[PDB]
Write a protein that binds this ligand. Structure first.
Ligand code: CL
Ligand code: CL
Lengths: 6, 368, 368, 6
């Protein structure tokens, strides 16, 4: 899964 | 009442190409496919708009003319003027509800829509103004445009933040997975102000930069931005919302520093990308003493492996990334050496030109 | 049994690009997306096919190699080889059901499909053979390719006739509305033979002409055509059917001769086309003493009028044409002066370069 | 209407 910057 | 003007072809072409920039979407309001032509005092004003933004070109009228306004199909009028020979004198005049274009023994009768129906952006006053070289604005946009979101629910991400602070102009773009920030000194004291320009407006602003030495004069209001370059005025509404703070997204204390040649890194990521998953684009990076290993696997179980000699003396770690996000940064840097600053496998990476700190990129990894 | 070869990158790239020409359609048989690689004696043969035609490239293997065959994804294998640095030695080898590509510290593992499943065009013997300069074949195809039909029920029109007669090679293309014919001497006595090459095969043949001085050796059988240029062999099945006879389509006795400058005519038709009906493209030509008037009207009732000074001394007449058909001819002629030969308003027009009779165009008018 | 060559 792509992680989020926030 | 009876608009008429005669203008030499090459004084009309680039203006017509510029004001046609905001057009091209799905047909909505008929007049949005037309350019507004206005003759007033000694000027021919040409306007194209998509309701969110507009491009205006002012053309000085040296030859006989009569005032008035109308709108004509953009592509047909540009295609007529473009198709005429070099040096053609283009005589234009309104004849009832038709606009006549004449040059030599070529005659074109175009349909028109009333100038009263043409959408004009609402009245506004600027709160901030500054003039800068076109090359600086080009640098700022090109360094960050690729990191803007495309149709994110958070509409403030489908645009670019333009921020003035001290003597610097800065751009920030992010989609929440990756972020790009570029700052440039512009030689004048500015108030601290931040606006979000719609992504289409950012593309329009870029297109209007001819590369020459006419300066870019920017005016910013509460809800609009205006950019003046030569005889072209670009205006766009701004995007509402709270843009994220790049200062809080930059990794706090990278304990791992990698340095490699930009091109060798770009080509290694480009080749590995060929065998990554076509939808998820996931690549694994294995950093170890003076070595970067990149791997890529796809659902066919095909596999790419790239090993690079790099400058790295931190702890060994593995971190997954979307390769398109990494390649966008490397493509935008186009420098000799690149520096990557990491923390751990679940935290963002900061990438930048080893020789400059004017632009910084933050890419969040994938759980891979 | 264990295919292996090592070949320098630039001895692989253009061959890989050439043999990938027939690929790209909708996925049907999985192996059609792959290139067949064969190592036999001192040669690496690369084949790409769409079942109707195939492109083969022979690459001499100077470095160590072992014989065998396999097939690999075309675009991925070309993208790996293309992405590697200039001068890379590309070592390829089969490892079980995987094909390994290695150069420097880059390693790619590709999926393969068995060489036994690769479609080979059936055995055939040529009945006609001739060798000509690539420039002559380019001239013949470019002069007539645009007049071929696209998906006409009469499948013989979705292709180009290649005819040998005396010492001339000739091409003919038509869709039943317009026709183009080009003949070129090829310096050798030929049997009288006529074949129809599929339109995709015509496009492939054009692409294989590098522009250099390696000659084009053509072999024609009952059901296939083969073209050899350097180390590339292109083979295609032919189209069945009776192609029309250009000799019976050429207007019998044009009683009206018009001559005008090619470019002035092209630009006048190009400008008039802007205000023609976007689907039907209809323009009216009014020929009178030393004058050609072109008019165009569309459903918005917009109108273009172009008047040209031409050389014309026949009877006054009006004739309607599809402007795209007229523009295709004028674009293909790219000469100084053009000659148009007419009969009446319901009959075809012959158009040709006023300085050459090697190519001739026949356009049938519209009832307009 | 577009006429045909034959
Ligand atoms: Cl002027
Ligand atoms: Cl070699």
């Amino acid at each position: 899964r792509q992680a989020x910057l926030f | 009442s009876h608009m008429k003007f005669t203008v030499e072809r090459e004084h009309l072409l680039k203006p017509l190409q510029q004001v046609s920039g905001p057009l091209g979407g799905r047909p909505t309001l008929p007049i949005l496919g037309n350019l507004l032509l206005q003759v007033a005092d000694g000027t021919l004003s040409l306007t194209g708009t998509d309701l969110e933004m507009e491009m205006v070109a002012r053309v000085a009228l040296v030859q006989p003319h009569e005032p008035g306004a109308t709108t004509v199909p953009a592509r047909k009028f540009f295609d007529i003027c473009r198709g005429l020979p070099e040096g053609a004198e283009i005589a234009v005049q309104l004849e009832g509800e038709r606009m006549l274009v004449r040059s030599g023994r070529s005659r074109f009768s175009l349909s028109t829509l009333p100038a009263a129906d043409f959408p004009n952006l609402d009245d506004w006053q600027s709160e901030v103004e500054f003039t800068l070289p076109q090359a600086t604005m080009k640098r700022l946009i090109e360094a960050t445009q690729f990191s803007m979101a495309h149709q994110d629910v958070r509409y403030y991400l489908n645009g670019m933040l333009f921020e003035t602070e001290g003597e610097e102009l800065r751009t920030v773009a992010t989609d929440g997975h990756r972020l790009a920030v570029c700052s440039m000194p512009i030689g004048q004291s500015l108030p601290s102000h931040s606006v979000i320009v719609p992504r289409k407006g950012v593309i329009e602003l870029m297109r209007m930069l001819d590369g020459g030495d006419n300066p870019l004069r920017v005016q910013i209001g509460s809800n609009n931005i205006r950019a003046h370059v030569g005889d072209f005025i670009f205006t766009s509404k701004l995007v509402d919302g709270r843009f994220p703070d790049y200062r809080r997204v930059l990794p706090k204390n990278p304990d791992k520093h990698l340095e490699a040649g930009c091109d060798l890194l770009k080509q290694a990521f480009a080749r590995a990308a060929i065998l990554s998953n076509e939808k998820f684009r996931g690549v694994r990076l294995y950093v170890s003493e003076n070595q970067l290993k990149i791997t890529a696997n796809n659902p066919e179980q095909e596999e790419a492996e790239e090993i690079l000699d790099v400058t790295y003396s931190g702890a060994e770690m593995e971190i997954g990334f979307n390769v398109s996000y990494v390649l966008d940064v490397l493509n935008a840097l186009k420098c000799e050496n690149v520096r990557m600053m990491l923390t751990d496998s679940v935290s963002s990476v900061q990438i930048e030109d080893a020789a400059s700190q004017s632009a910084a990129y933050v890419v969040m990894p994938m759980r891979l």
